[PDB]
Symmetry: C3
Subunit: 175 residues, 3 copies
């Protein structure tokens, strides 16, 4: 059973679900809208071999970023052309990891599911790869897995990026 607006507000009011920072107007009929943090990481090695430690580069945007589909094949010239024309701070290609501004804690009787905003889906921008259920008892900001599938997309620091849907568990979990 999925929490409505009135349930989200109660659970947040009594500290059953923690959302920091919290904003009332981000509560929709049965979800809570989350926003795009300013930090991203880009993988730097040839393959992902999870028996090794991974190497990343980190960026911190001031306003905006251009996210390009895989195999756009960006040269320095192209990146510079995009930076000047669209006034973006960075131009990336392929998978980029980001994060919500919002920190969450879920209690033992709630699971949440992150989904990317539907207006971004309509321009083929995803902020999640998996269906994205999050365990009861989870604590943290949410990691975004950002990929553009059609053409490059500009994203803005602190925009609404997606939303959490909260669902009751049948019974409490052992967290």
């Amino acid at each position: 059973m999925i929490l409505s607006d009135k349930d989200i507000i109660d659970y947040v009011t009594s500290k059953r679900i923690i959302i920091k920072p919290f904003n009332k107007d981000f509560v929709g009929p049965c979800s809570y809208d989350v926003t795009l943090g300013d930090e991203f990481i880009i993988y730097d090695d040839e393959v992902y071999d999870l028996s090794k430690e991974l190497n990343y580069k980190r960026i911190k945007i001031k306003n905006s970023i251009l996210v390009c589909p895989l195999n756009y094949n960006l040269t320095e010239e192209k990146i510079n052309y995009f930076k000047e024309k669209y006034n973006v701070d960075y131009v990336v290609e392929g998978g980029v990891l980001g994060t919500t501004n919002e920190y969450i804690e879920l209690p033992n009787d709630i699971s949440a599911q992150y989904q990317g905003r539907s207006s971004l889906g309509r321009v083929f921008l995803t902020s999640h790869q998996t269906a994205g259920w999050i365990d009861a008892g989870f604590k943290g900001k949410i990691t975004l897995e950002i990929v553009a599938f059609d053409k490059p997309v500009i994203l803005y620091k602190n925009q609404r990026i997606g939303q959490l849907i909260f669902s009751k568990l049948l019974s409490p979990a052992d967290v």
Copy 2:
């Protein structure tokens, strides 16, 4: 809690959930199958900059369309080769937006989730990018975000494209 076949039929019978057109045989154990409309739109600008108005081209298929993965790099020659060999009306590459034939209205105590058909998923054809929850109180046809991830896929006008799963809210939402 997810509505079963018998619940979907009741909610539709009493006009709690509107599905137009409605077909009984599209009701499965715990979902409702939806069909592919004949209209698609293709984005026409270099980047998606959502502070501007977007330019699209619209197509109306009569039978079928070939959807190609991004960076198939279609020339006129290739498009013509595909049109003749597979008898398709159009050949597209990358993201294409479509719509269900079905118009839906959800009441204040139901959220629905669109998911693409699993036989299409097995050939790497998606009709949705986000997890696709739809708010209680929603009205409209459902927008499909169609992308092929392996090789080109033929789709047919009015085929089953996906399905709606309906879930009860804990409490009514203020719609």
Copy 3:
């Protein structure tokens, strides 16, 4: 309503949900972790035309596979370079279909949803394209639709690949 660890164990203990093979430690707060089978199939025709019978090639890994993003454009030389450097049995590009080791049966009052593991999502490896709800009454192993979206990813025979979330239906379905 989503089953917790204690519910998953009960349903499995009384044969309400069948999971073969079953392992207690794969039960998380509100999901059940599933593992990567050793068999994969790769589509062999130019387009997916679902009015025809499909041609596939089958592989059986002994340890590991390298999954490359679409349009990595693998030559024999590149495949050999990867096989030797990363000690993988096979190198594939684009969509590859696999399967869980686990065979499941769901009763008439449960629907399950497969989602890929979140650590794999963070390296842009998906094992499902659709949201992946599975009907009440389903019987079988789960088909994985594996695509890498950023750089090539090594997967291991029998690793945790994803997880099932089980949700109660409002009423029983006619299976």
